[PDB]
């Protein structure tokens, strides 16, 4: 016999010492949680406490790995194929024929989408607001990708408690 407090709202309930499922009596909580690891009961079926902890961790790490890949990849609006520009201007032609602006990723029909005025590298255009035809976004994208890895590093420090953190993507140069 043991008295247990809900891991969320702290409402108390009497539980048999051989029951692992905690069902909170609080009408405004109602959360069903595991009693050994405080994990959510629905997400817990068929898994041990360790297998659930690993499952949520992999879910998080892969979410950041794909968040970094998403910043680098251009997805064709028609066929969904991922594109990367090796060189050239910012007008992309996917193998399906559809065209897109490599900067803002919108679907376009031709060169009329782009600003072609005299324009210094990474400088605003004093005569339009269209996308630069020649600007290379590789450095800016690599910065955004690193911001994701750093923000994922700091959100790990909040959950773990200590200053323990493991890098998600590949290392630095």
């Amino acid at each position: 016999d043991e008295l247990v407090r809900c891991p969320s709202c702290s409402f108390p309930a009497l539980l048999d010492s051989d029951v692992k499922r905690f069902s909170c009596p609080n009408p405004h909580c109602r959360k069903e949680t595991c009693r050994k690891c405080q994990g959510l009961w629905k997400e817990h079926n068929g898994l041990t406490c360790e297998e659930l902890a690993e499952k949520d961790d992999i879910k998080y790490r892969t979410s950041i790995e794909e968040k970094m890949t998403a910043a680098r990849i251009r997805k064709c609006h028609k066929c969904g194929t991922g594109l990367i520009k090796s060189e050239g201007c910012n007008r992309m032609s996917c193998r399906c024929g559809a065209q897109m602006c490599y900067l803002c990723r919108v679907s376009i029909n031709g060169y009329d989408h782009f600003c072609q005025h005299p324009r210094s590298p990474g400088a605003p255009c004093q005569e339009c607001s269209r996308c630069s035809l020649w600007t290379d976004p590789t450095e800016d994208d690599e910065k955004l990708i690193e911001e994701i890895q750093k923000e994922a590093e700091e959100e790990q420090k909040r959950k773990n408690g200590e200053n323990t953190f493991k890098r998600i993507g590949p290392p630095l140069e």
């Binding site: 992999i58 790490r61 892969t62 790995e65 794909e66 970094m68 890949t69 998403a70 910043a71 680098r72 990849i73 066929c79 969904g80 194929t81 991922g82 594109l83 990367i84 520009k85 090796s86 060189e87 050239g88 201007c89 910012n90 007008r91 992309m92 032609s93 996917c94 193998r95 490599y102 994208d141 690599e142 990708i145 890098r167 998600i168 993507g169 590949p170 290392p171």
Partner: protein
């Protein structure tokens, strides 16, 4: 490990790999399952291009990570 690879065709396949397998080994295992020649494969993980020289552990590719096959296109 067990990792996922997303084809150009949209299908996601699964591979049995080890962190010591080089990228060339992975491109081979992709060819055995989908018939995609390795010289045609452009692999990208966590936003970074994969090169034939290094291994999966060098790119910090862990369990259930996804490698994306992409088209490396020239602008125009």
């Amino acid at each position: 490990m067990q990792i996922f690879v997303k084809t150009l065709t949209g299908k996601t396949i699964t591979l049995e790999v080890e962190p010591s397998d080089t990228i060339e080994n992975v491109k081979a295992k992709i060819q055995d399952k989908e018939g995609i020649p390795p010289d045609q494969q452009r692999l990208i993980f966590a936003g970074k291009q994969l090169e034939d020289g290094r291994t999966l552990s060098d790119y910090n590719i862990q369990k259930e990570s996804t490698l994306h096959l992409v088209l490396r296109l020239r602008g125009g």
